[PDB]
Design a protein around this ligand. Structure first.
Ligand SMILES: Nc1nc2c(ncn2[C@@H]2O[C@H](COP(=O)(O)OP(=O)(O)O)[C@@H](O)[C@H]2O)c(=O)[nH]1
Ligand SMILES: [Mg+2]
Length: 170
């Protein structure tokens, strides 16, 4: 058989949410993708031997309330919370996004993965260990990625699927 997973990608604009999503759905690096486009994208993959259909909401324009975004997040099964490792502000914003998720999911056990993107870049400002501390305080995995080189992309999305699987077993 197959299983579907409803995923949401959140984080400051410019962190690489669209680039990460497109690496998953199309397997290459799209460096210019309209920063205002928010949409969902479907991709069939295989994870741990199981056929999986992922439906991924790539968020954008979070400065304005969107009812469609809110309804998708309310029913979303798991969340990637993305920052860029060369942008300290995007890391400090993670708290805002996790609050926003737990605010709309009525739960403190929501499948989530913290993602530090742009790890191909040399001028890092957020140490891996600082991000590991934050993920531990939330009880969630931390995965480093580069949408440019594809490093860690499958790891981030597949780890989220694995977290959802465990949650659904409860
Ligand atoms: N070097 C590098 N640049 C990236 C990476 N991911 C995204 N970018 C660039 O970061 C900027 C924002 O990417 P985008 O996917 O539009 O981010 P979004 O606003 O979160 O959807 C663009 O200039 C991308 O080319 C990455 O992993 N490495
Ligand atoms: Mg985008």
């Amino acid at each position: 058989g197959m299983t579907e997973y409803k995923l949401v990608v959140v984080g400051a604009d410019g962190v690489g949410k669209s680039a990460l999503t497109i690496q998953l759905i199309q397997n290459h690096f799209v460096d210019e993708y309209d920063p205002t486009i928010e949409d969902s994208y479907q991709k069939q993959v295989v994870i741990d031997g199981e056929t999986c259909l992922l439906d991924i909401l790539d968020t954008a324009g979070q400065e304005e309330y969107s009812a469609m975004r809110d309804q998708y997040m309310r029913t979303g099964e798991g969340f990637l919370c993305v920052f860029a490792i060369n942008n300290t502000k995007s890391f400090e914003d993670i708290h805002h996004y996790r609050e926003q998720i737990k605010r709309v999911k009525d739960s403190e056990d929501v499948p989530m993965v913290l993602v530090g993107n742009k790890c191909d870049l040399p001028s890092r400002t957020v140490d891996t260990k600082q991000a590991q501390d934050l993920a531990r305080s939330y009880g969630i995995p931390f995965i480093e990625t580069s949408a440019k080189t594809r490093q860690g992309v499958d790891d981030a999305f597949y780890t989220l699927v694995r977290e959802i699987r465990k949650h659904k077993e409860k």
